[PDB]
Design an enzyme around this catalytic site. Structure first.
Site, PDB file in Angstrom:
ATOM      1  N   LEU A  80       0.825  -1.200   0.000  1.00  0.00           N
ATOM      2  CA  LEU A  80       0.000   0.000   0.000  1.00  0.00           C
ATOM      3  C   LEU A  80       0.862   1.254   0.000  1.00  0.00           C
ATOM      4  O   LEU A  80       0.540   2.241  -0.670  1.00  0.00           O
ATOM      5  CB  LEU A  80      -0.922  -0.018   1.214  1.00  0.00           C
ATOM      6  CG  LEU A  80      -1.898   1.144   1.337  1.00  0.00           C
ATOM      7  CD1 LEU A  80      -2.845   1.151   0.162  1.00  0.00           C
ATOM      8  CD2 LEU A  80      -2.646   1.030   2.633  1.00  0.00           C
ATOM      9  N   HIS A  81       1.968   1.224   0.750  1.00  0.00           N
ATOM     10  CA  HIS A  81       2.915   2.332   0.769  1.00  0.00           C
ATOM     11  C   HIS A  81       3.514   2.585  -0.610  1.00  0.00           C
ATOM     12  O   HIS A  81       3.580   3.736  -1.057  1.00  0.00           O
ATOM     13  CB  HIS A  81       4.007   2.040   1.798  1.00  0.00           C
ATOM     14  CG  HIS A  81       5.240   2.870   1.639  1.00  0.00           C
ATOM     15  ND1 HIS A  81       5.211   4.246   1.560  1.00  0.00           N
ATOM     16  CD2 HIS A  81       6.545   2.517   1.570  1.00  0.00           C
ATOM     17  CE1 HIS A  81       6.444   4.700   1.436  1.00  0.00           C
ATOM     18  NE2 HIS A  81       7.271   3.673   1.437  1.00  0.00           N
ATOM     19  N   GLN A  82       3.922   1.518  -1.311  1.00  0.00           N
ATOM     20  CA  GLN A  82       4.421   1.691  -2.679  1.00  0.00           C
ATOM     21  C   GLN A  82       3.330   2.195  -3.616  1.00  0.00           C
ATOM     22  O   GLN A  82       3.594   3.041  -4.480  1.00  0.00           O
ATOM     23  CB  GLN A  82       5.018   0.397  -3.237  1.00  0.00           C
ATOM     24  CG  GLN A  82       5.876  -0.397  -2.294  1.00  0.00           C
ATOM     25  CD  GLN A  82       6.492  -1.608  -2.961  1.00  0.00           C
ATOM     26  OE1 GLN A  82       6.280  -1.851  -4.148  1.00  0.00           O
ATOM     27  NE2 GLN A  82       7.252  -2.384  -2.196  1.00  0.00           N
TER      28      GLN A  82
END
EC number: 3.1.-.-
Lengths: 298, 187, 49
Positions: free
Chosen positions: B28-30
């Site tokens: 999700l961060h990427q």
């Protein structure tokens, strides 16, 4: 009266090797014979062993071989000869009614989707498994799968999965020498962490000769993860074919002996008192005979 | 942000829910560095504050077009065999709001020692005198164990859910989906 | 190697909570293992008689 024999050692069919992991770049998966191996390097935090890819390599090649042997219900050690003959009649009844066509299909799925890539599979952008049938030293028949389009959950029919299923069927029946070379490329990312198997300096990682590797029993547990016939609540998928079919991630033994669905009660009902279980549970019992083990009382 | 999408972890014989939540939060961060903006927020609707466990659900708060961009983006490739998605759905009302913030701690005195020897040209013993071993405070918080791509370090990203409110205030979100001031609906 | 318990239980150990508490503590061994190298398909076994 045909009691169960006091010893039953079944040898393990579906013999894998240690799964050596190397490193390299995607779009040269076909030139992956001289790829540099993944080395377990110690870093200081306490001292931990940690394995990553190199900083210019985004593809983890995990390579091992698999021997599908054959002669599943024949035990390697058995006291009672009458029990051995009745067990062989039961297993031969299974194979004559329905050969290893569901079991080898599910094993071919667990080869096709790279469950043997255990934690190196969870966020991989692309996984691709190549299974080569090695006969007299060269590739007799080559497969090339997309391990992410084939799920870990569902067993979907295919055209090449069926061919590998009949291959593992012929090897599992005894009508051929099946050795497969299974190569799987996990596109994780440049320099990302790979997860080889782990030893018992708070962390030691398993390596054979300055090259990281997964244990052969972890690969074999990922192949045996075919048991969907258990009483399924909670939305859990296939589990590994174990007696008292248990998961240690959840601390819960499915197929408890309070239900009549563990391997031992189904086997003792199938061979002694002729109470043949369902097609699903007898698939599971023959999968525990392929898994091997030490059955029989003490 | 009136739309949401809950991402529930399936149970797995292989992996615990904490590790799958870690992998999902990293992906999700990427996906949020890749998409950009600041209008994407997260929540943990199965939070157990007593045991500090993040639960088995991750809710994503956004606009409609952002969630229809995220649902077809390949950041979930390789994760789809461990998750199940709902649909982009509208939130109910009335719904209380809470802040989901990243809380970091000074749990290592030696790093502060390196900082003070870099910032005041001190010695090791003077820095160890000014910074004792009692300043290492640990958090009683649930967390995700992430790894970075800029550097190569493994960090625990501790997530704290704020106190419940009756209204939300304006503000943006970090690229981890957590708050730099903005609020998400809790239900 | 690490295993679960897979041997037969003797009707006093077949409780559900006791079986789950037994599989919550998996046994750890270190086995000796002899394998072929990853670039060798042939095992030579040489003795004299």
């Amino acid at each position: 009266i045909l009691s169960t024999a006091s010893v039953l050692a079944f040898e393990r069919k579906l013999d894998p090797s240690d799964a050596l992991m190397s490193a390299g770049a995607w779009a040269q998966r076909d030139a992956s014979q001289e790829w540099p191996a993944v080395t377990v390097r110690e870093k200081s935090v306490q001292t931990v062993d940690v394995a990553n890819l190199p900083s210019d390599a985004d593809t983890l090649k995990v390579r091992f071989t698999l021997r599908v042997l054959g002669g599943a219900g024949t035990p390697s050690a058995c006291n009672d000869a009458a029990y051995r003959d009745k067990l062989l009649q039961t297993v031969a009844t299974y194979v004559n009614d329905q050969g290893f066509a569901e079991l080898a299909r599910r094993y071919a799925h667990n080869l096709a989707n790279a469950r043997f890539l255990w934690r190196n599979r969870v966020g991989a952008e692309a996984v691709e498994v190549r299974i080569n049938h090695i006969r007299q030293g060269e590739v007799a028949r080559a497969w090339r799968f997309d391990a992410l389009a084939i799920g870990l959950r569902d067993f979907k029919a295919d055209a090449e999965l069926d061919a590998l299923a009949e291959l593992i069927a012929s090897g599992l029946s005894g009508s051929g020498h099946v050795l497969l070379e299974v190569v799987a490329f996990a596109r994780i990312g440049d320099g990302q962490e790979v997860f080889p198997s782990q030893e018992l300096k708070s962390k030691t990682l398993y390596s054979v000769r300055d090259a990281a590797a997964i244990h052969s029993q972890k690969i074999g547990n990922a192949l045996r993860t075919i048991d969907t016939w258990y009483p399924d609540e909670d939305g859990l998928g296939p589990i590994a074919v174990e007696p008292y079919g248990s998961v240690t991630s959840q601390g819960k033994a499915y197929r408890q002996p309070k239900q009549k669905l563990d391997f031992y009660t189904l086997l003792d009902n199938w061979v002694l008192r002729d109470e043949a279980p369902a097609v699903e549970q007898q698939h599971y019992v023959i999968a525990n005979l392929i898994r091997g083990g030490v059955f029989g009382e003490a | 942000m009136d739309h949401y999408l809950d991402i529930r972890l399936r149970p797995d014989p292989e992996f615990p829910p904490a590790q799958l939540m870690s992998v999902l939060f990293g992906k999700l961060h990427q996906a949020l560095v890749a998409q950009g903006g600041d209008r994407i927020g997260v929540s943990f609707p199965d939070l157990d504050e007593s045991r500090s466990r993040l639960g088995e659900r991750l809710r994503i708060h956004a606009s409609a077009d952002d969630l229809r961009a995220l649902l077809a983006r390949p950041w979930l490739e390789g994760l789809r065999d461990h998750l199940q998605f709902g649909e982009p759905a509208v939130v109910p009302h009335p719904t209380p709001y809470r802040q989901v913030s990243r809380v970091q701690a000074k749990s290592n005195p030696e790093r502060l020692r390196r900082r003070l020897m870099r910032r005041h040209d001190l010695s090791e013993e003077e820095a160890r005198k000014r910074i004792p071993d009692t300043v290492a405070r640990a958090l009683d918080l649930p967390f995700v164990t992430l790894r970075s791509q800029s550097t190569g370090q493994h960090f625990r990203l501790f997530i704290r859910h704020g106190p419940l409110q009756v209204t939300a205030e304006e503000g943006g979100f970090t690229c981890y989906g957590l708050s730099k001031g903005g609020f998400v609906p809790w239900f | 190697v690490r295993g679960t318990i897979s041997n037969r239980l003797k009707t006093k150990d077949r409780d559900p909570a006791k079986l789950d508490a037994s599989i919550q503590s998996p046994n750890l061994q270190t086995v000796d293992v002899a394998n072929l190298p990853s670039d060798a398909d042939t095992l030579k076994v040489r003795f004299t008689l």
